[PDB]
Amino acid sequence: DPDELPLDEHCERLPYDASKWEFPRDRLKLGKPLGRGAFGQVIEADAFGIDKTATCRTVAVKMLKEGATHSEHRALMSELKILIHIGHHLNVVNLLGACTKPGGPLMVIVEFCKFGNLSTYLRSKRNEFVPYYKDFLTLEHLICYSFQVAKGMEFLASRKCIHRDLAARNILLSEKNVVKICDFGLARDIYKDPDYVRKGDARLPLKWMAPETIFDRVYTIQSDVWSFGVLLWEIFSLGASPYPGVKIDEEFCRRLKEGTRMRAPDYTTPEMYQTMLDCWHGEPSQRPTFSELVEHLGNLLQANA
Numbered sequence: 001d002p003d004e005l006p007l008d009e010h011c012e013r014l015p016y017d018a019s020k021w022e023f024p025r026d027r028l029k030l031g032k033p034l035g036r037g038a039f040g041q042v043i044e045a046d047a048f049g050i051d052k053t054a055t056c057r058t059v060a061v062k063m064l065k066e067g068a069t070h071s072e073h074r075a076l077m078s079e080l081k082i083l084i085h086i087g088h089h090l091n092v093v094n095l096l097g098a099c100t101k102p103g104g105p106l107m108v109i110v111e112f113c114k115f116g117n118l119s120t121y122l123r124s125k126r127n128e129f130v131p132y133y134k135d136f137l138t139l140e141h142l143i144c145y146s147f148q149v150a151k152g153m154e155f156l157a158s159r160k161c162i163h164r165d166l167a168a169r170n171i172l173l174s175e176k177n178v179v180k181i182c183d184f185g186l187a188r189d190i191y192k193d194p195d196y197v198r199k200g201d202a203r204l205p206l207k208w209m210a211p212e213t214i215f216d217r218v219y220t221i222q223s224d225v226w227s228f229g230v231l232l233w234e235i236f237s238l239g240a241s242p243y244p245g246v247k248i249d250e251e252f253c254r255r256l257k258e259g260t261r262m263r264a265p266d267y268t269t270p271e272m273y274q275t276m277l278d279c280w281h282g283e284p285s286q287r288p289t290f291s292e293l294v295e296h297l298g299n300l301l302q303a304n305a
């Protein structure tokens, strides 16, 4: 079914309306790099007037770096088109503009999320956590983050997109405890990142991948639900690495097929752990949908109050 088909697949037919999205290069001041991959990078910048008249705005800019080729340039352009087509949501990193004019690099400009990726943030807060003192993390915050990511994913699903690398490292934290789904893509160095394992010529986030994705190489929204379950484990471990100490080999993949699951993380509630287990159902059609996760986490959020 073409309607099931992720817009990600046929991006080349998506419009780029420059009269709306093009931002003048002479209004963007590039600062220091925030992160770098092999072929891509994200740079901190100040954009003059990009979202509000005459207002300086700190933004993040994704662009390529030494090593990239025309194929990565094409990939970044497709990413830009995808972001445009998806549209705005509180819990997805918001596109502000782009520089596509010849004579300089392709630049994708998005809102700056000052606290960075959620995994690192949660670990820096282990010292400042109480289950139920200002600036302290609490259980309510953890549930609220989970709810927000479910909302963003429900939204992405509704725009006919699937993420394919959902993990705490791809969630960013902005001010006022708002989290945003991201995909660093080329701006992450995956051959240097332990989270990505060599399988063939590819490097894959095995510890986050559903069984059907590992064995049959199928990516669906329900396999994102499986990954969301792992993300939940990350959140309620305050940013621990999944399957700690475990060797991620073919025996690991088999155990996973058999029904082996992670034990509960140190900060979970019973209901949150059952939710993870639900997300990790061997049968994809028996996992909850993101719509159901949204309703359920909202209920948990209210009960925790």
Ligand SMILES: COc1cc2nccc(Oc3ccc(NC(=O)/N=c4\cc(C)o[nH]4)c(Cl)c3)c2cc1OC
Pocket: 034, 035, 042, 060, 061, 062, 079, 082, 083, 092, 093, 108, 109, 110, 111, 112, 113, 114, 115, 116, 117, 172, 181, 182, 183, 184
């Ligand atoms: C404080 O430190 C950082 C703050 C950041 N704040 C905002 C954005 C950042 O990096 C990006 C991460 C991802 C994308 N792209 C992106 O998310 N593309 C998508 C997402 C989806 C669904 O389809 N395409 C971009 Cl442009 C930029 C940041 C990186 C930081 O430190 C490294």
